[PDB]
Nucleic acid binder design. Structure first.
Lengths: 125, 183, 196, 168, 30, 215
RNA sequence: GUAUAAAAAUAGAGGUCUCUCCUGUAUCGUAGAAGAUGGGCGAUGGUUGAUGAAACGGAAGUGUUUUAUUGACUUGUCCAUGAAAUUCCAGAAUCCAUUGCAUACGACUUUA
RNA sequence: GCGAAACCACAGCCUGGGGAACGGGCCAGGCAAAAUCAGCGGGGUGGCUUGUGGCAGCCAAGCGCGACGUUGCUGGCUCUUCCUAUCAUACCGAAGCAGAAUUCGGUAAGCGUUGGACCCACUAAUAGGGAGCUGGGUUCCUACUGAUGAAG
RNA sequence: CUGCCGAAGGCAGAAACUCAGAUCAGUUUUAUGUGUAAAAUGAGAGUUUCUAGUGGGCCAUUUUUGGUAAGCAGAACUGGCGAUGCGGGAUGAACCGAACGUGAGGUUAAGGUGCCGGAAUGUACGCUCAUCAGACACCAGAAAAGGUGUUAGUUCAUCUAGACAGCAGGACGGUGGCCAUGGAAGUCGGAAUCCGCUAAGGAGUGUGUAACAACUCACCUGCCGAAUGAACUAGCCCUGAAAAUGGAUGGCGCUUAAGCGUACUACCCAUACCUCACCGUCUGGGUUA
RNA sequence: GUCAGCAUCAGUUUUCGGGGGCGGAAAAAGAAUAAGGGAAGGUGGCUGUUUAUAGCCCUUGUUGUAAUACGUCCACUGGGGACUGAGGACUGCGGCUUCGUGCCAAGGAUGCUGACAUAAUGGU
């Protein structure tokens, strides 16, 4: 578990208006800023500092300075999407997001469901 | 500089475990453990090579990479070949009396310039003191830790020190004569 | 981040000034604070400089009745209390009542060793001090300024850690049993689309 | 922040000079008013053209043609110090000329205690050639296999229940 | 703790006297 | 102001030419190539400057400059090389090799002995008797007045009663073992003539033949 | 809801060669005329109260586990009754006496 | 048992600051627990300054000056505490320091630094300074110290 | 008791009447040389008369001469103080804001947002470790400078013809050049200090020897493979002396700052600014129903 | 009489959100797609080379009259919160309405409702 700042490392934005989005480092601008892209259309090409992002463990082969078109091409080829989701870290994050999106009636659904989960508390003797 | 590196290739010394800056190097002669918590560097071990890596370190912190390189190398030399320090007892008129107890781990010294006192030292761990018959009045400190053997040597030399006498004429004392390895 | 009756702070690895300021703000807010394990508080600056700071603090004494002179407290808990009270208006009834809401102790006594001990990130040395910087320990500065109860606390802390490790192992085993039964229960997969 | 401006100006035409020459300068200022004053004093100190008898004929903000390509910019500047005179040349790797100038101002205020009025910028040029780069730290960034862990990780919600991770 | 031999804080006469005599120094060098 | 190693200086007043010296050496190499004959390839060895002067005496000149500097001046490519088939000769041209003008029999046979140097192997196992030091290892029919040598030796010796005395015998050299700096320095004070200067006459860059053999 | 107890490091930790952290937005709990009255179906569980006995906890033990016997409530799921005009928030010591190891007077040290 | 008077804006802890006059009131700190008793009298002006003189010339790192150099000439008797700028004691370094005795210098204020008419002894030494009294010379309260003392 | 007007270092007010003016201005333009003269903006402008109080001084500002280790002294103008409360600078006669009726709400100035303390333990980039750090405030007295502390620069140097360094070696022979001497061979001491060889061995950089001898550099060759060196400038840091009870960036404390510099947002509140109510004074319009 | 809650308003004010123009290099970028040029911090290939089994940079065309971004404006609009309710028949300035004792957010708050009275407010 190292998370070196490589060219082609996919990262998770954690500060700014693009919080929660997934990107990939295209170029390392300097000691304290980098250029990232993503196949998703809502996230444009921009230069972001390392304080507003956390590096993931997934590294994807990517030539330096590549345009967004082939970045999506290589992203789809190596299947980075749903490879990040395969990690339990993404499952926890999306579980939190669904739990935040949750409402009062469905909170009462969770009420009953986890009560039925505690129903058993059955342990072999 | 972003990445300052030093590389060490390990000889037939068996194990160089580096868990949490606490290196435990086991070789043919013995096993030495020593701590590196005082510095913050990467120790990346691959094959028979260890890389000491510092990222973005200042020059003050970069001064410690080669220091860590040297101490680990000295530890490897100790577990492979060991260290041996040879002192010659120098006396003008009063012979110096030396006694060895608990297999050389405590040295008692008498009659240094006609002393009625008993100067006693306890050797640092991993050090054994012997008297060699090849040359008269010859003291040998052998061990695995160079620091322990050499600091034992310093303790002997400083405790057997001439006070208030003119050193340009009074030459009596114990001095380190040769430094080397066992093999 | 919810108002508790009592907050037990495990002061290991914290910075004296930062933890004192956070605690002093909580006491004025009206919260009872118990700062346990005060022999592990960290102070920036190398040990010799800090001891010179403290030994200069001893120099302040009255020239008539040093019994009325400055009271130099050597215990690490009392050192933290002095740091905290200097950040409070203790000359008024509000500050004097705030001091009564703080209990700084040495080690973790039995009434507080069985309770959850939160930590303050704004005072943690690991998060707040640049690596490669010299620091000192209050439990070490205290021993070389006059504190004479270091050995007893260390022994009673080794006992406490042994007992706590045994307790955690028992609780971990029970949690493993509960965890194993979790996926065995079906509704945990049947209707888990809500994220739970 | 800063924006790069081009200011073109001339003195008011008279009988002596029916067609005065047109003087254009590329300069950096937070807004157009500061740029015009920045230009006027520069014109005074280089060509002795008074502000009263002159006029700003054209003001144009300039945007970076390729803000999405990382570039290396070398900056020639002149400093007013205790002696009142110094010359420096620095290199900054950034995707915009404006950001490079901002980084230069921050560095000089951090190192030589330099202010905006004390610093006058002679030339900000792009260095495409790797060999023409003189600064070792810039060359360190330009190496092909650059890699390094995150530096200065540093990490209301007071009273965290668990100890910080500050690692991977 | 101060940890000094000389106090880093200054008296009001002393701080006022600097602007009194620093200005005169500029007058003298002029 | 900066933790940097000090650079001491003296009053020698003997600064070298550097680039000018290299240019002069290249010009001398060209002149030696343009010289009449005898096409020697031998510049220096472990022998002393006295041996080099003695060798130069039997000539009317041994000169190579910095090694591979003359080879660079000549050029590996035959077009740049003044001679013919010098592409293979440049590779063989390494170490101290140079031309001369005056031979073959003297170079092959006459090899004067000289003090040995470190890195080689001693011809035998030289030993030193204990007690008082012997200047010629018993061959002197040997003053012990080398009192300063007692401090400057480092061998197991003690200056007793104004005479350097060795407590125990120390073997200075061993046959079949590489010579170290300490052994070479110790043998320098004694008569260790373990050297034999040689020369290389594999080929000759004749004006007409132009056949630089590699024998 | 007066709910939540390893330790240690942060240029590393823990779990079964493999996996996890990357914060408690987590976990336990959570319906009921402030918690009513009955009926089933499904499980030997949970909340546990009362006593009764074992062990553990001395750093300020402020409590912890283990049970046993029972009296309870047993939302586990599915049904039936009543709520309302709260009809728009609120045994000792001392004095008197005695002692002189004490003492300006108190106090003290003894006897009584 | 009898029973005053002087004095009285109000009072009563200290450190640093409050331009001054620093004060008790103001600022920032140390602190701070009733009621009292007997004693004794304390309290009613440069961030200065220090160890290296005056005139002329020669250089000349540099910006007509020009630094260091270099050469030319004539008040005492007892008292608490603090500072080190150390006389002695402790430990060190250097010196033709053989030993003994000694010189200079460093850390060092823990502990000492006398008796007599500058003089002569003793002493290991007789180091330098900061914050009740007398001689020749001009014609209440508060502090300190002891003593009780109600009270969870 | 309350209200209004309100100074002075010839004033402020009162009454008597001019002109609805080109009539004045602690002002700026235009023209001629701070003077004068004839467009901007503001204002209703005025004349004779008498009658209270005062005619001092402190602080700073810019213009000069006399000056000296060193400050200092004498002028002119300008303001502030004086008659002036309020916010901030820890507190303050002269520092930064702001001129004061009683209140409600909003917003700020100066200064600030770690706690005391209302307000971001905000964001971004750098610098600094101080066994007596800094928050200081033209850093002006010590001040001229020292430092193998660090970060940036400026100007000259060599460098895969192999850079610096490192180890191996050569570092010679005329010659122990000549006077000088007990003994001086490069190295107690007096002018150089020449030559054969080169790639280089200096009539010699130091140690040392009675003299020698021996080692070293300064000078070159072998291995070794890339950058390295010298002189200056800038910022921070140490030092650039100061004593006498306890001790002060205001305190606590702070070291990827809560110190230094810059940039950008957000936030805090004065009697100040804005909206409203009310009190009083003045001014203006109207008022025989 | 006291205290409350809400609605519709008026004055002041603070804090979010949407829509729409208009400007700059008629944003610069970018994407997609046709030319040519260059190379690297040199990929596949074989230290050296020129898109191949990765790609990058520069210029032009095009999609185009792209969007975005900032600035600016709307007599465009949707919310949240707070302080205030001065005045006291009628005129007035205005908009709807067919004029109308017509209505209206138009020369200053009205409407609805609840609780308490031995309580609450207010004074000391």
């Amino acid at each position: 578990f190292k998370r070196y700042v490589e060219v082609g490392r996919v990262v998770l934005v954690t500060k700014g208006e693009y919080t929660g989005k997934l990107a990939v480092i295209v170029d390392i601008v300097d000691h304290k800023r980098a250029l990232i892209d993503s196949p998703c259309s809502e996230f444009p090409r921009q230069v972001i500092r390392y304080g507003s992002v956390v590096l993931t463990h997934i590294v994807m082969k990517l030539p330096r300075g590549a345009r967004s078109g082939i970045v999506a091409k290589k992203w789809k080829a190596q299947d980075v999407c749903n490879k990040w989701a395969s990690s339990a870290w993404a499952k926890k994050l999306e579980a939190k997001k669904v739990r935040s999106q949750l409402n009062d009636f469905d909170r009462f659904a969770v009420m009953r469901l986890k009560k039925q989960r505690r129903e058993q508390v059955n342990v072999a003797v | 500089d972003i990445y300052k590196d030093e590389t060490l290739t390990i000889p037939k010394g068996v194990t160089v475990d580096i868990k949490a800056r606490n290196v435990t190097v086991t070789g043919p002669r013995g096993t030495l453990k020593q701590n590196l918590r005082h510095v913050d560097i990467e120790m990346k071990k691959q094959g028979n090579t260890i890389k000491f890596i510092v990222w973005h370190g200042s020059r003050k912190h970069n001064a410690c990479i080669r220091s860590v390189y040297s101490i680990i190398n000295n530890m490897i030399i100790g577990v492979t070949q060991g260290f041996r320090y040879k002192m010659r007892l120098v006396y003008a008129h009063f012979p110096i009396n030396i006694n060895l107890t608990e297999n050389g781990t405590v040295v008692e010294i008498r009659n240094f310039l006609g002393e009625r006192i008993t100067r006693v030292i306890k050797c640092l761990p991993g050090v054994t003191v012997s008297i060699s018959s090849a040359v008269k009045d010859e003291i040998i400190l052998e061990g695995n830790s160079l620091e322990n053997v050499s600091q034992s040597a310093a303790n002997i030399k400083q405790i057997c020190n001439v006070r208030n006498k003119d050193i340009r004429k009074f030459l009596d004392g114990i001095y380190v004569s040769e430094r080397g390895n066992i093999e | 981040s919810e108002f508790q009756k009592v907050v037990v702070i495990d002061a290991k690895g914290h910075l004296l000034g930062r933890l004192a300021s956070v605690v002093a703000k909580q006491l004025l807010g009206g919260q009872k604070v118990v700062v346990v394990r005060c022999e592990e508080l960290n102070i920036s600056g190398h040990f010799f400089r800090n001891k010179l700071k403290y030994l200069a603090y001893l120099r302040k004494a009255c020239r008539y009745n040093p019994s009325r002179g400055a009271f130099h407290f050597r215990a690490p808990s009392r050192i933290f209390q002095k740091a905290v009270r200097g950040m409070l208006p203790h000359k008024t009834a509000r500050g004097q009542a705030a001091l009564e809401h703080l209990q700084a102790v040495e080690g973790i006594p039995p009434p507080f060793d069985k309770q959850k001990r939160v930590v303050v990130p704004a005072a943690l040395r690991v998060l707040r001090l640049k690596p490669g910087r010299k620091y000192c320990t209050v439990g070490r500065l205290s021993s070389e300024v006059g504190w004479k109860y270091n050995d007893i606390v260390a022994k009673l802390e080794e006992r406490r850690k042994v007992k706590s490790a045994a307790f955690y192992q028992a609780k971990l085993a029970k949690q493993k049993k509960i965890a194993s039964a979790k996926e065995a229960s079906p509704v945990n997969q049947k209707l888990s689309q809500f994220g739970y | 922040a800063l924006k790069e401006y081009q200011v073109v100006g001339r003195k008011v035409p008279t009988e002596h000079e029916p067609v005065p020459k047109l003087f254009r300068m590329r300069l950096f200022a937070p807004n157009e008013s500061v740029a015009k004053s920045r230009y006027w004093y520069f014109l005074k100190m280089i060509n002795k053209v008074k502000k009263a008898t002159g006029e700003i004929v054209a003001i144009n903000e300039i945007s970076e043609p390729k803000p999405l390509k990382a570039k290396v910019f070398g900056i020639w500047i002149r400093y007013d110090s205790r002696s009142g005179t110094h010359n420096m040349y620095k290199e900054f790797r950034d995707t915009t000329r404006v950001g490079a100038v901002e980084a230069m101002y921050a560095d000089m205020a951090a190192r030589h205690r330099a202010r905006f009025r004390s610093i006058r910028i002679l030339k900000v040029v792009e260095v495409e050639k790797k060999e023409d780069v003189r600064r070792n730290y810039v060359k360190q960034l330009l190496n092909p296999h650059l890699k390094f862990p995150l530096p200065h990780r540093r990490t209301k919600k007071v009273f965290a229940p668990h100890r910080p991770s500050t690692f991977y | 703790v101060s940890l000094k031999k000389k106090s880093k804080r200054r008296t009001t006469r002393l701080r006022s006297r600097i602007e009194k005599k620093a200005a005169e120094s500029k007058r003298k060098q002029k | 102001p900066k933790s940097r190693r000090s650079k001491v200086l003296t009053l020698a007043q003997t600064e070298k030419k550097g680039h000018e010296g290299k240019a002069a050496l290249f010009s001398g190499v060209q002149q030696s190539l343009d010289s009449f004959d005898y096409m020697w390839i031998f510049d220096v060895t472990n022998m002393r400057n006295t041996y080099l002067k003695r060798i130069r005496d039997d000539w009317k000149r041994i000169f190579m400059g910095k090694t591979k500097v003359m080879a660079k001046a000549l050029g590996h490519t035959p077009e740049e090389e003044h001679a013919e088939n010098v592409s293979k000769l440049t590779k063989l041209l390494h170490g101290a090799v140079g031309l001369l003008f005056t031979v073959i029999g003297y170079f092959e046979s006459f090899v004067q002995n000289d003090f040995a140097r470190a890195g080689a192997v001693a011809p035998f196992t030289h030993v030193i008797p204990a007690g008082p030091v012997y200047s010629r290892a018993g061959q002197i029919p040997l003053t012990h007045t080398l009192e300063p040598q007692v401090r400057q030796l480092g061998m197991p010796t003690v200056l007793k009663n104004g005479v350097v005395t060795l407590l125990a015998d120390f073997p200075l050299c061993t046959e079949g073992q590489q010579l170290d700096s300490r052994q070479t320095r110790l043998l320098k004070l004694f008569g260790i003539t373990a050297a034999e200067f040689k020369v290389g006459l594999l080929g000759y860059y004749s004006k007409k033949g132009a056949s630089v053999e590699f024998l």
